Amino acid sequence: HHHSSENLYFQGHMLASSRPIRVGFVGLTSGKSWVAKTHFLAIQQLSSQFQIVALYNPTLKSSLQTIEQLQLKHATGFDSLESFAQYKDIDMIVVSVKVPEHYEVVKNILEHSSQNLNLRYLYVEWALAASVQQAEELYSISQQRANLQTIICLQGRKSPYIVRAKELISEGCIGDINSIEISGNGGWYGYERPMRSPEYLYDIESGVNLISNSFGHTIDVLQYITGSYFQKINAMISNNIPTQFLLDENRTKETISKTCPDHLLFQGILENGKVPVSCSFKGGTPVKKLTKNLVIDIHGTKGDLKIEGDAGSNLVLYFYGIKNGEEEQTMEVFHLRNYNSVVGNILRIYESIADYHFLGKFDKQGFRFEGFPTFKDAIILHRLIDAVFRSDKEEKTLDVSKIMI
Amino acid sequence: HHHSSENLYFQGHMLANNNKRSKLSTVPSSRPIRVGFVGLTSGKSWVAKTHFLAIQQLSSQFQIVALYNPTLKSSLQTIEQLQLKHATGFDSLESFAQYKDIDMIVVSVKVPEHYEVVKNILEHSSQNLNLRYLYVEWALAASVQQAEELYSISQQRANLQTIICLQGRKSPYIVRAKELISEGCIGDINSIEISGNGGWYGYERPMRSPEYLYDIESGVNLISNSFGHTIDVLQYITGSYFQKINAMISNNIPTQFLLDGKRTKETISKTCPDHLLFQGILENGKVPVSCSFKGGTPVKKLTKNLVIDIHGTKGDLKIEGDSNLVLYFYGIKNGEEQTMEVFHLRNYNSVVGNILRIYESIADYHFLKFDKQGFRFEGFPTFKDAIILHRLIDAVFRSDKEEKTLDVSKIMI
């Protein structure tokens, strides 16, 4: 039955350990910040699992206002990361600050939590750091911490669409994968820039660009769905759009330089089955008009699968193959009618966190449906992304056969 | 209206001149191009069903005077079936090649035989001065080495025009796209995506299909052939050669299943490759191009099998199809209100249609020497355009052999 006791936990209920996981945020800046907007709402709907007991803000002011607005019952504000890092009532810390900043902050939290034994979770959003360097460092330092579980937010791995894809792929509904094609669009990196965008997104040294973020979340999901890591790759990155035109109500004559790359060519062979993958990622506008801007097209010996959507988003997964592992094919069209992905995917992550915690330190999620990704998953990703830049710079097809180690 | 005198040219009709510098000014110079074939196997061979029909329609401009066949019985049988009132059968290529009444020789034989054949044709056409045109089907030869050489010899024939059969260039969809881009309709080109399929190099092989096609060693494969035709059409349409490229080739399907057109457990070997990942930078505007070419079956069920998708600044244009092509366009009518055009020919027979167009261009050239057609709308591609494509292709296997991105910035020379 639907309302059976066995389903309480999944309905969000807790019998009377069972205490919520107490969370403390960094980046929960105001009652209208991204975090408010994304992480809070989510945590907000998982009341029996998570409770926010702390906010770190440069001022006690900012944190008091927020606690009132979001109406936070068990929160207490902190003026110092250090102090914040040491509050013994925190089980999990979530960091939501721009990447350029991840390095310091994180490195500091790690440093000042060594005292704190309650702290079992450290959560950070992709990308983990601004450079591979930085990230390997946060990785190594965390590795140092035996009882601390890390998490990276690659929420695309919780997309219903991806899950579904991976189920059909994993269940043999398209047989063996024969070839794969991907198209994506980075949004901010075309001929136009949106009004007031953190110049950091446009800077080559920030470590945030078409490649490290968009393609990154993308190829990661690809690998996830297919169950394989790459063995060899080759890239070509372009900068044919050196100055953008800004817009503001809706496009102006005002110009602005863009150090960031505006196009990525990626092609590689996945290790399992040496399967070929072709990838084309546009920086941004103008968008493609005769075709979907996001497409993940997977071609099997026994069927095909294709995720298409609106890189700006209305996704749909199409499947045509054997509902099985004489062979007879079936079509499937998959589209949720009104799913809030940003909030929803992040939310699933937390549930996943709650589940490991409530139901039952592990390495990474790798290709498992279970669990959540860890800084290890992030690191592997950082490695690849790094090999992409190097392949373009060295003009060579690189073996990345060994970055998951 | 339709049969107006004003429409005569287009209908492939040619009025007599009073013009001194015009072949149409005189009776003798207005004779139809006398054609000699190599490959006219029978009444049911491929040439019969392609080149021959084309010529049949261009009676006013072309005429068959000879065929070569290892066996005369063969050539005499063929002459009877197709009723060629003007054709003599040849026992030997050397004789066929010496025949003085020939104006053009067309070669349609297994690629692996191209080299020797054309090589000898060249060598023996050495006295016939009427020999003005040498027409060969793509691939020009089995390897670039062979190609370069055939090329080299021909260049040295001052009055011999050569023609290569890269008929995709005359595809109406290719011309339409070319016009569109040429005119600025989609602005500056930003990125290109291409997907194709080599038809037989997939999981199962058609019954009675010649082994050479599956022999890595043959010089005939997914790359040299279909990707070949496709990438040349791509550069043709965009008006650019490539700057640098990178390719990764697969052989995940070393053994196929036969068919008749049905499956079996009866199995077969394939050393030819089954997939190609090709990406590169086009010299003009340094535009990125990505491409995925599959070997054959199973055909893609959720997307069209051939797709040429071009993203530019002021618009987009896509040619997609399975022959069944449609060109789609959304962009500025000239070169802000963007328009939509869906271009599609009802029931076009591409197979003969495209080859016919090349013959019409030879005729124009003739009645109304050139290096290569390169990006011109005018004329037809020659051995030189074939040599460049062979070079690109050689570079693709090397780039896949060496695991490096290569510069091809100079193969056009």
mmCIF file of C-alpha atoms in Angstrom, chain A residues 176-181 183 191 232-236 238 240-241 263 265-269 273-280 282 284 286-291 297 299-302 304-306 318-320 329 331 391-392 395-397, chain B residues 188-193 195 203 244-248 250 252-253 275 277-281 285-292 294 296 298-303 309 311-318 328-330 338 340 400 403-405:
data_model
loop_
_atom_site.group_PDB
_atom_site.id
_atom_site.type_symbol
_atom_site.label_atom_id
_atom_site.label_comp_id
_atom_site.label_asym_id
_atom_site.label_seq_id
_atom_site.Cartn_x
_atom_site.Cartn_y
_atom_site.Cartn_z
ATOM 1 C CA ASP A 176 25.343 -2.463 -26.750
ATOM 2 C CA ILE A 177 26.224 1.122 -27.250
ATOM 3 C CA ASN A 178 27.502 1.700 -30.651
ATOM 4 C CA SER A 179 28.104 5.463 -30.999
ATOM 5 C CA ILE A 180 27.177 8.587 -29.170
ATOM 6 C CA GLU A 181 26.681 12.204 -30.201
ATOM 7 C CA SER A 183 25.515 18.937 -28.522
ATOM 8 C CA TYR A 191 27.759 36.895 -29.322
ATOM 9 C CA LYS A 232 41.404 8.643 -25.026
ATOM 10 C CA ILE A 233 40.328 12.092 -26.001
ATOM 11 C CA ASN A 234 40.978 15.022 -28.215
ATOM 12 C CA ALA A 235 39.739 18.653 -28.097
ATOM 13 C CA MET A 236 39.832 21.899 -30.061
ATOM 14 C CA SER A 238 37.895 28.283 -30.050
ATOM 15 C CA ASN A 240 36.153 33.400 -32.446
ATOM 16 C CA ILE A 241 34.098 35.857 -30.428
ATOM 17 C CA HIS A 263 33.377 26.884 -28.605
ATOM 18 C CA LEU A 265 35.168 20.335 -30.002
ATOM 19 C CA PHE A 266 35.567 17.129 -28.050
ATOM 20 C CA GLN A 267 35.797 13.582 -29.341
ATOM 21 C CA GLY A 268 36.894 10.495 -27.498
ATOM 22 C CA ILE A 269 36.555 6.795 -27.001
ATOM 23 C CA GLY A 273 33.694 -1.240 -25.700
ATOM 24 C CA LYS A 274 35.957 1.533 -27.018
ATOM 25 C CA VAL A 275 32.741 3.348 -27.806
ATOM 26 C CA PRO A 276 33.043 6.551 -29.916
ATOM 27 C CA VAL A 277 31.623 9.854 -28.580
ATOM 28 C CA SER A 278 31.326 13.069 -30.706
ATOM 29 C CA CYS A 279 30.728 16.388 -28.945
ATOM 30 C CA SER A 280 29.882 19.879 -30.052
ATOM 31 C CA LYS A 282 28.433 26.271 -28.485
ATOM 32 C CA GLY A 284 25.860 30.736 -26.110
ATOM 33 C CA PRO A 286 22.687 33.068 -30.869
ATOM 34 C CA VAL A 287 20.882 29.770 -30.151
ATOM 35 C CA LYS A 288 20.456 27.023 -32.783
ATOM 36 C CA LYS A 289 17.050 27.430 -34.360
ATOM 37 C CA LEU A 290 16.566 24.367 -36.509
ATOM 38 C CA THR A 291 17.650 21.991 -33.780
ATOM 39 C CA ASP A 297 22.016 10.920 -28.714
ATOM 40 C CA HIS A 299 22.934 4.664 -30.505
ATOM 41 C CA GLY A 300 22.838 0.956 -29.538
ATOM 42 C CA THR A 301 22.763 -2.279 -31.508
ATOM 43 C CA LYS A 302 19.327 -2.956 -30.180
ATOM 44 C CA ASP A 304 18.421 4.258 -29.586
ATOM 45 C CA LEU A 305 17.944 6.712 -26.791
ATOM 46 C CA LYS A 306 17.951 10.501 -27.095
ATOM 47 C CA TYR A 318 12.898 9.456 -26.403
ATOM 48 C CA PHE A 319 13.482 5.750 -26.453
ATOM 49 C CA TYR A 320 13.067 3.207 -29.183
ATOM 50 C CA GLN A 329 11.030 -2.718 -30.433
ATOM 51 C CA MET A 331 8.909 3.617 -28.425
ATOM 52 C CA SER A 391 44.842 18.104 -25.594
ATOM 53 C CA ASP A 392 43.888 21.343 -27.266
ATOM 54 C CA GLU A 395 47.258 19.376 -30.206
ATOM 55 C CA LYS A 396 47.290 15.664 -29.327
ATOM 56 C CA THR A 397 44.787 12.997 -28.556
ATOM 57 C CA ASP B 188 29.041 34.372 -40.587
ATOM 58 C CA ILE B 189 29.281 30.623 -39.955
ATOM 59 C CA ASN B 190 29.773 29.777 -36.231
ATOM 60 C CA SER B 191 29.846 25.910 -35.905
ATOM 61 C CA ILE B 192 29.073 22.851 -37.993
ATOM 62 C CA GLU B 193 27.796 19.328 -37.053
ATOM 63 C CA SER B 195 26.508 12.806 -39.093
ATOM 64 C CA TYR B 203 26.511 -5.232 -37.929
ATOM 65 C CA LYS B 244 43.753 21.342 -38.896
ATOM 66 C CA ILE B 245 41.905 18.069 -38.051
ATOM 67 C CA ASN B 246 41.746 15.178 -35.701
ATOM 68 C CA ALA B 247 40.209 11.730 -36.326
ATOM 69 C CA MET B 248 39.572 8.514 -34.278
ATOM 70 C CA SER B 250 36.968 2.281 -34.743
ATOM 71 C CA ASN B 252 34.416 -2.538 -32.866
ATOM 72 C CA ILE B 253 32.769 -4.713 -35.463
ATOM 73 C CA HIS B 275 33.075 4.209 -37.194
ATOM 74 C CA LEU B 277 35.067 10.515 -35.245
ATOM 75 C CA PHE B 278 36.415 13.485 -37.209
ATOM 76 C CA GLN B 279 36.672 17.059 -35.968
ATOM 77 C CA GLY B 280 38.585 20.037 -37.215
ATOM 78 C CA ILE B 281 38.959 23.711 -37.844
ATOM 79 C CA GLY B 285 36.772 32.032 -39.946
ATOM 80 C CA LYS B 286 38.516 29.174 -38.134
ATOM 81 C CA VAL B 287 35.050 27.535 -37.754
ATOM 82 C CA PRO B 288 34.693 24.383 -35.669
ATOM 83 C CA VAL B 289 33.306 21.230 -37.434
ATOM 84 C CA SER B 290 32.424 17.930 -35.587
ATOM 85 C CA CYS B 291 31.473 14.766 -37.276
ATOM 86 C CA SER B 292 30.380 11.201 -36.516
ATOM 87 C CA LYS B 294 28.668 5.230 -38.492
ATOM 88 C CA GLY B 296 25.933 0.975 -41.394
ATOM 89 C CA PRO B 298 21.418 -0.431 -37.458
ATOM 90 C CA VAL B 299 20.287 2.845 -38.949
ATOM 91 C CA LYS B 300 19.606 5.592 -36.425
ATOM 92 C CA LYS B 301 15.960 5.454 -35.357
ATOM 93 C CA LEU B 302 15.646 8.759 -33.498
ATOM 94 C CA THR B 303 17.450 11.056 -35.840
ATOM 95 C CA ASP B 309 23.830 21.184 -39.795
ATOM 96 C CA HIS B 311 24.965 27.298 -37.353
ATOM 97 C CA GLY B 312 25.804 30.868 -38.356
ATOM 98 C CA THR B 313 25.331 34.326 -36.950
ATOM 99 C CA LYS B 314 22.200 35.422 -38.738
ATOM 100 C CA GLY B 315 20.666 32.068 -39.224
ATOM 101 C CA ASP B 316 20.776 28.293 -39.540
ATOM 102 C CA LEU B 317 20.564 25.725 -42.321
ATOM 103 C CA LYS B 318 20.240 21.967 -42.089
ATOM 104 C CA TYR B 328 15.811 23.625 -43.964
ATOM 105 C CA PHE B 329 16.659 27.248 -43.471
ATOM 106 C CA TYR B 330 15.807 30.001 -41.043
ATOM 107 C CA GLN B 338 14.332 36.058 -40.357
ATOM 108 C CA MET B 340 11.920 30.072 -42.994
ATOM 109 C CA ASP B 400 44.266 8.575 -36.200
ATOM 110 C CA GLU B 403 47.058 10.241 -32.190
ATOM 111 C CA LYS B 404 47.682 13.874 -33.017
ATOM 112 C CA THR B 405 45.864 16.913 -34.478
#
